Motif scaffolding. Structure first.
Motif, PDB file in Angstrom:
ATOM      1  N   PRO A   1       0.805  -1.048  -0.054  1.00 10.00           N
ATOM      2  CA  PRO A   1       0.076   0.057   0.043  1.00 10.00           C
ATOM      3  C   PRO A   1       0.965   1.233  -0.023  1.00 10.00           C
ATOM      4  O   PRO A   1       2.102   1.132   0.785  1.00 10.00           O
ATOM      5  N   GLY A   2       0.440   2.262  -0.822  1.00  4.73           N
ATOM      6  CA  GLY A   2       1.158   3.669  -0.881  1.00  4.73           C
ATOM      7  C   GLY A   2       2.488   3.713  -1.900  1.00  4.73           C
ATOM      8  O   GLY A   2       2.962   4.473  -2.004  1.00  4.73           O
ATOM      9  N   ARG A   3       2.906   2.350  -2.071  1.00  5.93           N
ATOM     10  CA  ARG A   3       4.167   2.316  -2.993  1.00  5.93           C
ATOM     11  C   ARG A   3       4.055   1.767  -4.190  1.00  5.93           C
ATOM     12  O   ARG A   3       4.888   1.160  -4.873  1.00  5.93           O
ATOM     13  N   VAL A   4       2.932   1.945  -4.984  1.00  6.32           N
ATOM     14  CA  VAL A   4       2.550   1.462  -6.085  1.00  6.32           C
ATOM     15  C   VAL A   4       2.250   2.247  -7.256  1.00  6.32           C
ATOM     16  O   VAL A   4       1.636   3.243  -7.147  1.00  6.32           O
ATOM     17  N   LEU A   5       2.700   2.143  -8.471  1.00  2.00           N
ATOM     18  CA  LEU A   5       2.464   2.616  -9.691  1.00  2.00           C
ATOM     19  C   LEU A   5       1.823   1.545 -10.660  1.00  2.00           C
ATOM     20  O   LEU A   5       2.666   0.493 -10.809  1.00  2.00           O
ATOM     21  N   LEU A   6       0.594   1.737 -11.322  1.00  2.00           N
ATOM     22  CA  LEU A   6       0.160   0.744 -12.171  1.00  2.00           C
ATOM     23  C   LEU A   6       0.489   1.052 -13.467  1.00  2.00           C
ATOM     24  O   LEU A   6       0.395   1.979 -13.994  1.00  2.00           O
ATOM     25  N   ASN A   7       0.880  -0.215 -14.316  1.00  2.95           N
ATOM     26  CA  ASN A   7       1.461   0.107 -15.468  1.00  2.95           C
ATOM     27  C   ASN A   7       0.506   0.370 -16.622  1.00  2.95           C
ATOM     28  O   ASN A   7       0.581   1.268 -17.230  1.00  2.95           O
ATOM     29  N   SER A   8      -0.181  -0.942 -16.949  1.00  7.94           N
ATOM     30  CA  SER A   8      -0.660  -0.394 -18.241  1.00  7.94           C
ATOM     31  C   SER A   8      -2.063   0.128 -18.047  1.00  7.94           C
ATOM     32  O   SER A   8      -2.887  -0.248 -17.170  1.00  7.94           O
ATOM     33  N   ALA A   9      -2.539   1.389 -18.639  1.00  3.79           N
ATOM     34  CA  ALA A   9      -3.669   1.586 -18.692  1.00  3.79           C
ATOM     35  C   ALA A   9      -4.316   2.534 -20.098  1.00  3.79           C
ATOM     36  O   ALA A   9      -3.602   3.346 -20.290  1.00  3.79           O
ATOM     37  N   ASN A  10      -4.897   1.856 -20.753  1.00  9.36           N
ATOM     38  CA  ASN A  10      -5.050   2.179 -22.047  1.00  9.36           C
ATOM     39  C   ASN A  10      -6.349   1.774 -22.812  1.00  9.36           C
ATOM     40  O   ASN A  10      -6.842   1.035 -22.292  1.00  9.36           O
ATOM     41  N   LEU A  11      -6.632   2.353 -24.085  1.00  6.57           N
ATOM     42  CA  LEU A  11      -7.875   2.102 -24.741  1.00  6.57           C
ATOM     43  C   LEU A  11      -7.940   0.889 -25.928  1.00  6.57           C
ATOM     44  O   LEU A  11      -8.621   1.007 -26.632  1.00  6.57           O
ATOM     45  N   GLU A  12      -6.866  -0.042 -25.899  1.00  6.03           N
ATOM     46  CA  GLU A  12      -6.861  -0.819 -26.785  1.00  6.03           C
ATOM     47  C   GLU A  12      -8.279  -1.572 -26.995  1.00  6.03           C
ATOM     48  O   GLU A  12      -8.754  -1.841 -28.162  1.00  6.03           O
TER      49      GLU A  12
ATOM     50  N   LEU B   1      -8.983   2.145  -9.931  1.00  7.61           N
ATOM     51  CA  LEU B   1      -7.808   1.440  -8.767  1.00  7.61           C
ATOM     52  C   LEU B   1      -6.944   2.737  -8.545  1.00  7.61           C
ATOM     53  O   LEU B   1      -6.699   2.605  -7.334  1.00  7.61           O
ATOM     54  N   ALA B   2      -6.438   3.065  -9.735  1.00  2.07           N
ATOM     55  CA  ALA B   2      -5.364   4.138  -9.282  1.00  2.07           C
ATOM     56  C   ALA B   2      -5.853   5.322  -8.847  1.00  2.07           C
ATOM     57  O   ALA B   2      -5.240   5.730  -7.561  1.00  2.07           O
ATOM     58  N   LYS B   3      -6.964   5.805  -8.857  1.00  4.09           N
ATOM     59  CA  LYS B   3      -7.541   6.643  -7.955  1.00  4.09           C
ATOM     60  C   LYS B   3      -7.997   6.430  -6.608  1.00  4.09           C
ATOM     61  O   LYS B   3      -7.420   7.036  -5.775  1.00  4.09           O
ATOM     62  N   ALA B   4      -8.792   5.186  -6.358  1.00  6.94           N
ATOM     63  CA  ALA B   4      -8.992   4.750  -5.153  1.00  6.94           C
ATOM     64  C   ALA B   4      -7.790   4.478  -4.385  1.00  6.94           C
ATOM     65  O   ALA B   4      -8.031   4.635  -3.053  1.00  6.94           O
ATOM     66  N   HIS B   5      -6.810   3.732  -4.657  1.00 13.03           N
ATOM     67  CA  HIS B   5      -5.593   3.357  -3.822  1.00 13.03           C
ATOM     68  C   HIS B   5      -4.459   4.525  -3.947  1.00 13.03           C
ATOM     69  O   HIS B   5      -3.527   4.351  -3.600  1.00 13.03           O
ATOM     70  N   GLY B   6      -4.872   5.593  -4.554  1.00 18.42           N
ATOM     71  CA  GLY B   6      -3.822   6.877  -4.614  1.00 18.42           C
ATOM     72  C   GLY B   6      -2.780   6.132  -5.265  1.00 18.42           C
ATOM     73  O   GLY B   6      -1.654   6.868  -4.743  1.00 18.42           O
ATOM     74  N   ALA B   7      -2.824   5.432  -6.518  1.00 23.91           N
ATOM     75  CA  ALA B   7      -1.393   4.938  -7.088  1.00 23.91           C
ATOM     76  C   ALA B   7      -1.238   5.944  -7.963  1.00 23.91           C
ATOM     77  O   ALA B   7      -2.277   6.618  -8.653  1.00 23.91           O
ATOM     78  N   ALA B   8       0.007   5.924  -8.583  1.00 24.34           N
ATOM     79  CA  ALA B   8       0.550   6.488  -9.841  1.00 24.34           C
ATOM     80  C   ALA B   8      -0.202   5.680 -10.894  1.00 24.34           C
ATOM     81  O   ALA B   8      -0.305   4.511 -10.737  1.00 24.34           O
ATOM     82  N   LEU B   9      -0.299   6.279 -12.349  1.00 23.28           N
ATOM     83  CA  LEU B   9      -0.824   5.637 -13.394  1.00 23.28           C
ATOM     84  C   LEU B   9      -0.215   5.889 -14.329  1.00 23.28           C
ATOM     85  O   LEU B   9       0.185   7.080 -14.930  1.00 23.28           O
ATOM     86  N   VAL B  10       0.390   4.978 -15.162  1.00 30.41           N
ATOM     87  CA  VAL B  10       1.015   4.959 -16.275  1.00 30.41           C
ATOM     88  C   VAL B  10      -0.280   4.635 -17.321  1.00 30.41           C
ATOM     89  O   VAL B  10      -1.085   3.889 -17.359  1.00 30.41           O
ATOM     90  N   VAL B  11      -0.136   5.493 -18.556  1.00 34.50           N
ATOM     91  CA  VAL B  11      -1.122   5.504 -19.557  1.00 34.50           C
ATOM     92  C   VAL B  11      -0.425   5.363 -20.793  1.00 34.50           C
ATOM     93  O   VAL B  11       0.384   6.269 -21.342  1.00 34.50           O
ATOM     94  N   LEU B  12      -0.813   4.334 -21.728  1.00 36.98           N
ATOM     95  CA  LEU B  12      -0.047   3.958 -22.930  1.00 36.98           C
ATOM     96  C   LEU B  12      -0.712   4.721 -23.827  1.00 36.98           C
ATOM     97  O   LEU B  12      -2.024   4.420 -23.766  1.00 36.98           O
ATOM     98  N   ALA B  13      -0.034   5.244 -25.147  1.00 32.53           N
ATOM     99  CA  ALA B  13      -0.677   5.827 -26.187  1.00 32.53           C
ATOM    100  C   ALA B  13      -0.982   4.767 -27.036  1.00 32.53           C
ATOM    101  O   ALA B  13      -0.555   4.579 -28.175  1.00 32.53           O
ATOM    102  N   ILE B  14      -2.295   3.900 -26.802  1.00 29.20           N
ATOM    103  CA  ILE B  14      -2.783   2.764 -27.548  1.00 29.20           C
ATOM    104  C   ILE B  14      -4.201   3.072 -27.529  1.00 29.20           C
ATOM    105  O   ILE B  14      -4.737   2.705 -26.463  1.00 29.20           O
ATOM    106  N   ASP B  15      -4.876   2.964 -28.783  1.00 34.27           N
ATOM    107  CA  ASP B  15      -6.356   3.005 -28.812  1.00 34.27           C
ATOM    108  C   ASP B  15      -6.848   1.834 -29.621  1.00 34.27           C
ATOM    109  O   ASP B  15      -6.111   0.848 -29.804  1.00 34.27           O
ATOM    110  N   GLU B  16      -8.178   1.943 -30.206  1.00 32.78           N
ATOM    111  CA  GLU B  16      -8.753   1.004 -30.700  1.00 32.78           C
ATOM    112  C   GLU B  16      -7.944   0.467 -32.144  1.00 32.78           C
ATOM    113  O   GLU B  16      -8.091  -0.639 -32.370  1.00 32.78           O
TER     114      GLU B  16
END
Ligand code: COB
Length: 510
Positions: A95-106, A118-133
């Motif tokens: 808890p408190g020590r996490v960054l979440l890797n994939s978050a994307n629109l594939e 999850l990122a919001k709720a557990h106050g984690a950092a979020l990585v956002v890949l530039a991938i869409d549909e």
């Protein structure tokens, strides 16, 4: 300068590190914890963690490893996963020590919002890949479009803070040598610069090591390090690197620095190929550049043409070919003699481990340019004698042979429909129905490719076909194609393109 860069240690990643993979499988806890501590000593501020592997229970592996990493490390962990349940489990233990890797629109907004929440709720950092549909964003214009869309959703629907975000505009390898991926580093850097301005307060992260994939160690270290710096300059805040193998720019020789930039920004000159020049720099046994060039220019005309193919010397080729046409030399002879002899030598050098793969590509490029310039000077006899659908079979990529067959048959009055490479039997026969050819040609060099040919003929037999099929390739033997006649009675072996011509002539009745 503005702030130091947040370094994320790449090594605990089943997909990336073979060593970690084998350690994970073997349940080598001490090995893994050693590797983690080691990365932190070597200057990492956090650790990427990915245990996901084809055929393995992700959740099981995490349940095992996480409790240990939890107590045995002080630094954060970037959890690299597509499973939300996995991310939850990681968020439980760290808890408190996490960054979440994939978050994307594939796969649309569904997967994206699940991770973001999850990122919001557990106050984690979020990585956002530039991938869409439509898939991975390869240009800047795309990378920006996708980012902005995501930013809107993350900030408005989820209410994430800019500061909580890390945009991964993507890192592609520029070292395999194909023309299509020359600017994929440059386009990422441009996007980053534009987005730093338009989205103030967001972070940027890159998986830096990828840009260099499959170069020698020393070359990677340089290319990795220069890329990292240039991204930093354009707003990079974090970096997924091997902390222990990034050089400060102050310690990279001026020539290597410039060559790295040449490659990253694709600064092609007249007689310079960035990639190959960058590769060459790290090779030992360096002659006087002037001495080597003089030794080359001193060769006989035919022998120089050969060496052009081997050494991959594009510049002054059309000059030399022009000269040989001026003396008593015939196009097909120049190909079937010095040029193809060069191509053979490239083979032997690659086979001996004395030449790396992009140099082989650049050899082929010399051959293709050479034949392009010679094609107008070859005799063009006969017209409309028949049609040939020609293709390289599934999973086979070599096509200089195929293309010679195209040229020679086209020049002797045949319509050649060249379907290019890796063509499945479905697609071949689709074109057979379309073009109603007199024969089908299937190329393929490796052994596996001959078994594909067998399958292809089985398939064709089963769907009633009986038009002639001409098979060619290195590993093919006439003896073997004779056996295949038990499947498909109209197969022919072709040793070379001339045999192809001879077969087409016999088959169309000339
Ligand atoms: C004219 C032509 C010139 N020669 C060539 O095209 C290139 C020969 C060379 C040096 C190979 C060694 C060699 N000495 O042959 C080699 N590569 Co290359 C490193 N390669 C390439 C080069 C090709 C570029 C291209 N655009 O074509 C690439 C970099 C892409 C290349 C790639 C590979 N290569 C690979 C390997 C291993 C080899 N490659 C070989 C073929 C070779 C023998 C060399 C080696 N070194 O060991 C390896 C195969 C051993 C084996 N299995 O038996 C590999 C796997 C490397 C890698 N690890 O990534 C990879 C293959 C990936 C895959 N299959 O998906 C090259 C250049 C070679 O000869 P040809 O025999 O194709 O044609 C000839 C022709 C002339 O008249 O007619 C005939 N013919 C052929 N097909 C047909 C016909 C005739 C008719 C009538 C038809 C209807 C069809 C006949 O077969």
């Amino acid at each position: 300068q503005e702030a130091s860069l947040f370094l994320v240690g790449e090594r605990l990643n089943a997909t990336g590190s073979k060593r970690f993979r084998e350690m994970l499988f073997a349940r080598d806890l001490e090995g893994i914890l050693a590797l983690a501590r080691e990365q932190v000593e070597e200057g990492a501020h956090a650790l990427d963690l990915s245990v996901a592997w084809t055929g393995r229970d992700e959740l099981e592996d995490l349940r095992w490893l996480l409790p240990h990493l939890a107590t045995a490390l002080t630094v954060p962990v970037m959890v690299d996963s597509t499973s939300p349940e996995a991310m939850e489990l990681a968020l439980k233990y760290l808890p408190g020590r996490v960054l979440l890797n994939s978050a994307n629109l594939e796969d649309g907004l569904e997967r994206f919002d699940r991770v973001a929440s999850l990122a919001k709720a557990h106050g984690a950092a979020l990585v956002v890949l530039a991938i869409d549909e439509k898939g991975m964003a390869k240009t800047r214009e795309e990378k920006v479009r996708v980012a902005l869309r995501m930013y809107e959703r993350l900030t408005e629907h989820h209410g994430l803070r800019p500061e909580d975000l890390l945009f991964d505009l993507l890192t592609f390898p520029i070292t395999q040598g194909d023309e299509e991926s020359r600017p994929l580093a440059k386009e990422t850097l441009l996007a980053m610069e534009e987005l730093r301005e338009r989205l103030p307060g967001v972070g940027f992260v890159l998986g830096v090591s990828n840009v260099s994939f499959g170069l020698k160690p020393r070359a990677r270290r340089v290319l990795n390090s220069v890329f990292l710096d240039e991204a930093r300059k354009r707003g990079l805040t974090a970096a997924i690197v091997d902390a222990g193998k990034i050089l400060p720019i102050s310690q990279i020789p001026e020539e290597a620095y410039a060559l790295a930039l040449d490659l990253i920004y694709d600064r092609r000159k007249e007689g310079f190929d960035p990639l190959l020049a960058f590769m060459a720099y790290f090779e030992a046994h360096k002659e006087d550049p002037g001495k080597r060039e003089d030794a080359f220019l001193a060769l006989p005309l035919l022998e120089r043409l050969k060496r052009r193919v081997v050494e991959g010397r594009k510049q002054g080729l059309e000059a030399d070919l022009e000269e040989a046409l001026k003396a008593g030399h015939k196009p097909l002879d120049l190909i079937n003699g010095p040029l193809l002899a060069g191509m053979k030598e490239v083979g032997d050098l690659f086979g001996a481990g004395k030449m790396q793969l992009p140099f082989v590509l650049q050899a082929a490029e010399v051959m293709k340019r050479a034949v392009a310039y010679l094609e107008p000077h070859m005799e063009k006899k006969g017209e409309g004698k028949g049609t040939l659908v020609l293709a390289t079979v599934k999973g086979a990529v070599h096509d200089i042979g195929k293309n010679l067959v195209d040229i020679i048959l086209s020049n002797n009055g045949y319509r050649v429909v060249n379907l290019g490479i890796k063509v499945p039997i479905e697609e071949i026969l689709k074109a057979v129905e379309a073009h109603k050819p007199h024969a089908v040609g299937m190329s393929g060099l490796l052994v596996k490719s001959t078994l594909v040919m067998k399958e292809n003929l089985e398939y064709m037999r089963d769907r009633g076909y009986t038009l002639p099929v001409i098979l060619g390739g290195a590993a093919l033997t006439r003896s073997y194609v004779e056996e295949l006649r038990a499947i498909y009675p109209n197969v022919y072996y072709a040793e070379d393109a001339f045999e192809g011509l001879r077969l087409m002539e016999e088959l169309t009745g000339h």
